[PDB]
Structures are given as C-alpha cells and as structure tokens.
Amino acid sequence: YEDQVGKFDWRQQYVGKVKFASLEFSPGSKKLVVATEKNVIAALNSRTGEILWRHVDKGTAEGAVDAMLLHGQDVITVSNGGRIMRSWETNIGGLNWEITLDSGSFQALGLVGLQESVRYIAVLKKTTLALHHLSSGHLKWVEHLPESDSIHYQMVYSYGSGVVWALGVVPFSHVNIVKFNVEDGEIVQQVRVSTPWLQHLSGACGVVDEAVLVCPDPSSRSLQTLALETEWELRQIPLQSLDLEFGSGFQPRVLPTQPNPVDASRAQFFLHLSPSHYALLQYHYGTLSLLKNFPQTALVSFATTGEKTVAAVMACRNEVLACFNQTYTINLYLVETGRRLLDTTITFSLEQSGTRPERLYIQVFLKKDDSVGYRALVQTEDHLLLFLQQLAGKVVLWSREESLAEVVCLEMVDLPLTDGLLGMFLKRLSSQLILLQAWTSHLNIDTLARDEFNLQKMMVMVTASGKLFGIESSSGTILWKQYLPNVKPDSSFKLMVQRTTAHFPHPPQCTLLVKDKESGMSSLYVFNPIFGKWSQVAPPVLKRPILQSLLLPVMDQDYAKVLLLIDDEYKVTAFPATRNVLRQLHELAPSIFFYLVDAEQGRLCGYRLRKDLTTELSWELTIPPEVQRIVKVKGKRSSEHVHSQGRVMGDRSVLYKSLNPNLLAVVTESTDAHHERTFIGIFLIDGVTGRIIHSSVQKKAKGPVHIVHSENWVVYQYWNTKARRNEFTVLELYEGTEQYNATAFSSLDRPQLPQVLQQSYIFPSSISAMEATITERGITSRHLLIGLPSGAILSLPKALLDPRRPEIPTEQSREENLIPYSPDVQIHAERFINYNQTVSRMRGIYTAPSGLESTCLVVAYGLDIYQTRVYPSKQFDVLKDDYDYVLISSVLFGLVFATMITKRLAQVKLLNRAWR
Amino acid sequence: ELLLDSNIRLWVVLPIVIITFFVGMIRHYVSILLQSDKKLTQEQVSDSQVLIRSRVLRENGKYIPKQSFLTRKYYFNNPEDGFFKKTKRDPTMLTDMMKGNVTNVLPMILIGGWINMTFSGFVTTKVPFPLTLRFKPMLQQGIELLTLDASWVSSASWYFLNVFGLRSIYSLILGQDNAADQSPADTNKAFKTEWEALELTDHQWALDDVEEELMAKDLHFEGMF
Ligand SMILES: *[C@@H]1O[C@H](CO)[C@@H](O[C@@H]2O[C@H](CO)[C@@H](O)[C@H](O)[C@H]2NC(C)=O)[C@H](O)[C@H]1NC(C)=O
Ligand SMILES: *[C@@H]1O[C@H](CO)[C@@H](O)[C@H](O)[C@H]1NC(C)=O
Ligand SMILES: *[C@@H]1O[C@H](CO)[C@@H](O)[C@H](O)[C@H]1NC(C)=O
C-alpha cells in the first residue's frame, strides 16, 4: 500500500459473455444493463463502455440469470431458475425488492396491463402462473393452469385489454391456450388445437399483431396461423404464395415485437426462413404480406423509438458461408414498410479471423433533424463486445473483450532485450570509441524491450473461449490477440515456454497444449509469445489422446526446451523430437518418470522412460474412490530455488529441511459428506519411487481445500465442520541434524523417512485462491497470497505459519525468536496487497519471480484481473521513493565549501600564531 | 548474484565515501583551529628547560671530560650547591579537555547513527570475503532478510569500514600525524626523581680513546672539489 495508488498496479473489470442485454434507455441516461453468463449483473456506460454498478452472483448455477426485463428506470431480473425475482434500480445501482418464488421450472416471463399502464409481472412456470406487483413485488395471484401436468407452457401474453394469454404445447401433438384475467386470475377461457407437425412454441412459433399466433411449418413450407383473439382453429398459409421457402435441416423462426407491453404487437415481424436469410411479413386479419426479404444476412434486430419500429439488418459487404472480409454492414429498415433507412448504414470490420458476430442489440433515438440515430452493441463469436456509432469517425465506440472474464492459463514472458591479444585490444578500444560517440551524441510492440530490472514482462493469457492474449504486465494493455477455432468450453489447456527471448538469433517460442474433453484428442499450438503469430514449425499431430505432459529442462540447438507427451497408449512423443533431441532423451531415458493420477478410479501410476521411447509400470498405488476421491495433486513448483538448505536451530546447530524435489502432495476428500464423519487426507507420495512419505488424515473437516506446496512446507486451508471454521494446517518436512545425501538428491536413495511437523491454525474468513510468493533465488521471505471472497489479497508471512511455534515460550524459542503458538491467524486490513481493487470471484493468483530479489510480480485473475508487485521483504534492494535529494546534495555542496573555508581559517590561524 | 539498483551506487555508496573523507578533513581542521596554547609563566618553562638540560647532560656527558661532568653533578644534586633543593613551589579546564578528548570519536559515532537513520533499509555492497553469520545483526542493520549472505552489508557498517580505512589516506594527503582519526604537572617529584637518576648515573668520557681510534684509519679527503 503506502498510499502510492496506481503507481505500478492496474486492475481491469471483465464480465463474461453477455447472455442477456438491455439497451433501451433514456438518451441522456447513457446506460446499458447486462447480465452475463458469469452470473453478473452490471451497468455499462453507453459512451465509453465502463461499469457503473456491477453485481456479481454465485459462480454456480444457483444464481444464474434466467430472464431480464427493463421497465422505466429499474431492471427486473430472475435468478436461480425462477427461484428469486429482483428489481434493480439502474440509477442508484441497488436492489428495489427481492422476492423468492415457489417451485416449478420457469418457462415464460411477461408483463400485464390493466388498461393503459403496466403494473404487474406475469411469471409462468411449467405448472403454474404467478402475478407480482411492480411497486413492491407482492404476489398478486397464483393460478395452476389446467392439464399442465401434460402440457409444457412456452409463452405468456398480455396487453392493455387487462387479460393474460398463456400458451402450452405437447411435442408432435395438440397445444393448449388459456385466457386468464389480470384483475383476478381465474381461467377466463381455454382452447386446444391440433399441431401434429409442431415441435416447440418458443423456438419456432411466435405471436404477432393482436396476439395472433404464428407457427412456421417446414413440413408443408407454410405458415400456420391462429387468430388467438377469436380463432379457435389454426389456419395455414403456404409461403409459396409469398414467394418464400424454408431451409433444409433448419428450424425457421418468427420474431415479433411489442414496443410496450400494454399495446398489441406490431403486425410486421421477421421470419428466419434459413440461415443467412430473413423475411419481413406483415400479418393483417388472416393474411400476411412480405415487406422486405433480406438474403445473406446474419443477424437482425428490432428497436422502438417510441412511435415507430426500426429493424437493423447485418450482412457483410460481399459474401465469399463465411464472409469475404470481416466487414459487416448494418442497415436500418422501417418496420411499417420494408424500406431501408437513408444515411443510416454502418460498416465495421472484425479484427480477428474465424469470428463472426453473434448478438446485436441496437438503441435508437431521434436526431436533431428527426432522423433515427442508432448505435449497435454487437457481441462476436469469441465473446467480444463492440459499440458501433452511426457517425463515420470511430465507427466503433468502445470495444470490450469480455472473453477475458474466464481465463484458463496465463504466463509471463520476458520482454526482448533492448587468439592474439592485439585483436582483442583493437576491438575493445573500438568499442570504447563507439560508446564514447554514443554518449557524446546525447548533446508499443514494435519497440518492445526488456526493462533493466526485468520488472516489466508480458503476460501470455489463454481464455477458455480459445483466445490468446498478450498483455503488457505494466500497463495492462493488450499487445496481440489470436483465436483458436473450435475450442470447447470444457477443453483442458497447458501453456509451456519452449524458448524465451534470451536467444536473439532464434525467435521466442511458446507451446500451448489444448485437449478437448469430449473427444480426448489433444493438439499443440506453437506461437511466438512476443508477437503472437504461430511459428512456422508445424507442431506434431497428436493422434492419440494424451494423459500428461512434461517440460524437460533439456533444450534443442535453438534453445527450445524439450517437451514430452504421454499418449493414451502410454507411448511418449517428444518435441521437437529431432535426432539430437531423440538421442539426448534416449540416452537420458531411465531418469525420466511420469506420474498419472486417475482421480476417477483413485489411482496413481508412475512410469519409467525406456531407451526406445516407451514407458513401463514402475510403481502403482490405489486410493479407493469408495472412501476417498482425489481432489488435488499439488506438486512443488519446478521453477523455484531454495537458498538455505538447512536452518539455524540456535544452540549453534542446524536442522536440515527435507528438500525432496519429486514430492507430490496429493490431497483427497472423504466421499462421506456427513458433517460429522467427513475427513480430508493428504499424502506426501513420492514422484519417482511412489513412496508415501506421510499419510495424514484430518477428521471432521470438509473441503474446499486450497493447498500451496513450496520448497519444503505445504499449507492447505480447509473447512472444519465440527466447529464451523476455516482452518489452516502447515506441514513442514525436516531431515535430521545432518544431511543424508548432500552432493545430490535422489528419490531412490532416501531410506530415512523425513520427520513431519504439523500445526493447525484458524482462519477467521473464507478463501478463494492461494499462492506462495516466489523469488528468483528464494532469498526473500515467503508469503501466501490469500484470496478472500471479498476480493482483497492478504499477504500472509510464511514465518508466521511455522509449525514449531511452541505453545509455551522457552529459552530455545526466544533464542530462535519463535512466537508462541497462536491458533488464530489475523486478517489485518493493512496486509492486503490491494487496497480497494477487489477481484470479485477470484480464480487464481499468479506469482512471478521477476528480477531483483525483493519484488515479486502478482497477477490475480478471476472476474477482474489485477496486477501489482509485492515486497515480502519491504523492497530492501531498491532506493526509497522518499529520498531527500535536495538534502543530500545540499549538505554535500554546503560542506565542500565548509571544508574550503575551514582550511582557509586553519591557514590564517596558523600564520597568525606563527607571527604572533 | 543480486541485481542491485544502480542508483544505490550513485546516492548511497559514493556519498558515504565523500562524507567520510570531508568529515575527516573537517574534524582535523576544527581540531587545529580549536587548539590554543595555554599561557606559561617564566618559572614553569625555566624549570622544564633546566630539567631538560640536566637530562641531556645525563644522556651525553660522555663527550665531556670527567671534571666538567662531576662539577655539573655538584651543581645539580648536592646539598652544598643548593640547586635541586631550593627549587620548588565543574572546573573549566577539565570540562574543556574532556570535550576535546570526546570530540575525536563521538562525532564519528553520531554521524554513523545519523547515516543509519538516513540510509536505513538498503543493501550497499557485498563484502568479498565470507564473514561469519553471527555478525549479521550489525552488518545488515535495516534489512529484514534472514537467509541473506553475511557478506552483504548495510549502510552503517559500510560507513564504519570507510571510516576505518581512511586514516592512512588522511596521513598520506593531509600530512603526517594528522589529528583526524579514531584512536611537567609536578616539578617537586620531578626534581627528586631527576636527583635520584643523576645520582645513579656515572661518567664515561667518550674522548678517552678517540685519538687511538682515529689514528687507525686515514682521514677521508675525496670530494674536496
Ligand atoms: C479506492 O480506489 C481508488 C482507485 O484505486 C483509490 O484511488 C485514489 O486514492 C487517492 C488517495 O489519496 C484518493 O485521493 C483519490 O480520490 C482516489 N481516487 C478515486 C477513489 O477515484 C482510492 O484511494 C481507494 N480508496 C480506498 C479507501 O482505498
Ligand atoms: C479487412 O480489411 C481491413 C482493411 O484493409 C484489414 O485491416 C483487415 O485485416 C481485413 N480483414 C479482417 C478479417 O478484418
Ligand atoms: C549420496 O549417495 C550416492 C549414491 O547414491 C553416494 O555415491 C554419495 O557418496 C552419497 N553422498 C553424497 C554427499 O553425494
């Protein structure tokens, strides 16, 4: 902290892919109300695209937004599958009323009107319908629709008539409609019609004009209609009479509108005949007419300026499916007549490739000349928000990358660098003249260079939407973006730095390993981590599903770290797998061991590496899934160092840490979820010989467990069900007073089981993410970056979590300066590495060693992404920011003159004394 | 190793050296400026010079024949002659001398303390030899590290080493036996001890054998030109 806000740290707030959006607002209100797939309800500034008020929710589906509506100035939302309905004041940025609802799967939501004004909400669940007041949310009336045990309701309609229309269908069979009254709610009427060809109502059918139901029928290429106000039998109109046809293997849709719930719907509506094809149809008393046909158009949208409806149609400049260049034009068409608006065409280009717009929400207003001026928020396929304004300059207003809401993996890449003695002297003196000339002469990804302290790196981020980003670690800006086509949401990623920027003759090179979960096939993408472009080195095609990957420290000739993959057939594939690489890893084969942790079966296997690139069953253990399921397999970071091999115990003696570099820390939960019988096991299984160093099982405890594994110790936070309190438990591994094998450490040559020191602390809050502070040489003290749900980042000193803290202080403890054991761990607000930059729904904390020895770079990723530096040792090796230059220089240059003056004084006094 | 900040050199290493150098010069110059000779009356200087003559006589009366020497002895320490017998006789000075003695080290320690406060929290230099771990609490004042090598030193001990290594330089440039470093009242007893010493002394006329030791070798004469 130290009140130097914004000097080094930066936070970016990211919401997820925009599931539901609302643009309709006052022209001066300049607000967007959006609920995303991340359970987040937020308000975006229309002008610049910034958060006004953001309300995240539970990450699980138990707070998922299911339906949004806007009325006047407050937005009404439904969450938890219709369980709760809330009203949010868009201006203040808070709730207005929160009401829980009854059981039953929600199917349709709508509003009702008495005579001219909407005042109640009609919410329909698969078995019932409910009315709630707008003023307070009080339930008006609940009616169980008849026969609903068989029908599935799909829509709700009401308008100024003071009645409620309910519609339900049964697949490939008859459908039913119910008339309720807003005043009471009783079943005013009920009708049923036969729809043998119908599948579902919401996706296919629609309702236009005066509640007239319209189902597009692709079986007969027609438009089945039912004048729902009066008609009791569906009518049919073929599209051939209107010169229209449906696509093959597609579900045509119908898009009506309703400028305000009180009035009836507009007669005109859209029909999605086939993909890249739309029609405008105007229903008028049993017959319909084609207003305008839009071929090769991706997305259409409707808007109302208050009196007239406006349709926005999206298509690229010239089709080449796909589109020639990602240049999409949106045109305005009046809804009263299928006529394109004048001077309203917008044209933009999508930066990425393989990405096409997915969602389009437009907001309209009256210009000075009464011309419909509109803006368009378009979400692409790769979860990117673009705000397009009509005026040509800056055709995009604010481009928001919501995709970065869900980051899977990220890495920090260093920036690029900025025989005879006579020959040596000649070149050295030449260099001297060159440097002298350079000094005397002193009288953006293009120029990217490494800092002096290496404190400014570049973060290569991977997003489950399959998107790769390059973000400057200092400013947080994006330097390069790439997209991976066809990446499933649940795919597993793995990013590896094959070659850093310290090899100027060779390009930097990183490898990302993705693995589709459903198929099992894994692929390797090699790219320059600085520029983001795929390397020309074609990665091998991983034919078989793979299980694990290793980044061997051995490097190819071009300083590319060898990467090994173990496939499903337990074979090993190398990369680059050249002759030199093949020889090196074939010659060093028996010293390479894989461990595969099958969590489903509770099995651990450890395989050797044969000379001929084959694996053999070296060791195998089985934790029975019937009583224990593996939940964490946290091993120690490979890229860390230990400064002090042993520790001073006082007494002028040393206690040796048990530095096992092949030590797993497999943490498993108890399959018994009872609050009194649950337990959490931690096994310190070795990674080579498979030996379980320790097999601790904490009783009466429950997950989730957040474990950090470091040089020697492990720290795993958990929940204690017996006392209902989050608890830590530090396990420190210590060897004897004298080291067993020094020169080198081998997991096959450790017959002495290391002693374990344990201690359980109480944490007075929850947790969201943990990660130890890592330094280049490990000299700087270790800190745990506790991630609280609140968003803060506690910097807990590891020295506090010592298990050797005695319960009663003694002379040995005082000599060693050991604090007496205190089961309570403080959450002092002064320890947070962030002040108020809370990272809502924190997902992980990345710690980078950086340069120097006191500064560790921190990137907390979750919904928001925040970056800073931490000084676990108070930045001991850097000049203080409050140095008194004007004092040191002043004393120096007021003391040199003092020295001169006092020398003169001494001379004068000596002369006078000599002469007397 | 450690990538130390370059600015630690330009603002914490060199300024310490400059400060030490010029503080030594200032201290020496202030010392010579402050020194004022105390007024001495005729009697004290007279008796000091008299005992000086007596002692130099005791030292080298060998180049004087025996009778002259024993006449000197009679004059100095002998009842009949009378000499050496009828020859005898918070305060500001203590505070002044105590302050003068104190100002040779205490200013250095105060400067060290001021530097320790001013330059607390740094790592100035790495001592190129492996110091013991037990010296850590004082070499690395202002550093929170635990596993840091003892060879890394804070500002205070670096200043101490600087002030330790500059006395020879002071003698080199300022002049020999400079005052920038770190480190008779009673005549009656003096009269009696001179009495006893010159009583104990004997005579050996060194000229008793000069001629014989001169006749042995010819007189040096070259270089007459
Ligand atoms: C809240 O966060 C902001 C942004 O990080 C902090 O920024 C400024 O801090 C200075 C501190 O003197 C204030 O004077 C400014 O008004 C802040 N700017 C804002 C709030 O926009 C701010 O300090 C943080 N506040 C707290 C209490 O941590
Ligand atoms: C489209 O054209 C623009 C302008 O030439 C160009 O910058 C862009 O890369 C092109 N392609 C895409 C996919 O946007
Ligand atoms: C360690 O074990 C190896 C054998 O594995 C042995 O040769 C060596 O002497 C032992 N000690 C050290 C310090 O390496």
Tab-separated table of C-alpha atoms in Angstrom, chain A residues 632 704-706 717 726 763 765-771 785-792 839-845 861-862:
chain	number	residue	atom	x	y	z
A	632	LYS	CA	-5.768	-32.012	-5.518
A	704	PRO	CA	-12.881	-26.985	-0.488
A	705	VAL	CA	-9.163	-27.166	0.291
A	706	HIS	CA	-6.629	-24.659	-1.013
A	717	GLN	CA	-6.666	-24.423	4.078
A	726	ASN	CA	-11.840	-22.332	8.167
A	763	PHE	CA	-8.577	-18.591	9.622
A	765	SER	CA	-12.596	-15.837	6.955
A	766	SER	CA	-13.205	-17.832	3.797
A	767	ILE	CA	-10.725	-18.177	0.920
A	768	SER	CA	-10.731	-18.116	-2.875
A	769	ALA	CA	-7.122	-18.504	-4.020
A	770	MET	CA	-3.681	-19.162	-2.547
A	771	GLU	CA	-0.133	-18.942	-3.892
A	785	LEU	CA	-1.467	-14.682	-1.282
A	786	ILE	CA	-4.715	-15.468	0.461
A	787	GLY	CA	-7.621	-14.756	-1.845
A	788	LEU	CA	-10.620	-13.695	0.157
A	789	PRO	CA	-14.124	-13.783	-1.332
A	790	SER	CA	-14.294	-10.038	-0.697
A	791	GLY	CA	-11.621	-9.530	-3.367
A	792	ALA	CA	-8.674	-8.491	-1.206
A	839	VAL	CA	-11.120	-9.072	-7.529
A	840	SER	CA	-14.662	-10.400	-7.477
A	841	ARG	CA	-14.966	-14.161	-7.947
A	842	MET	CA	-11.224	-14.635	-7.702
A	843	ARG	CA	-9.985	-17.662	-9.615
A	844	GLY	CA	-6.217	-17.782	-9.162
A	845	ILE	CA	-3.150	-15.843	-8.106
A	861	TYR	CA	-7.084	-13.438	-12.195
A	862	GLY	CA	-10.793	-14.087	-11.780
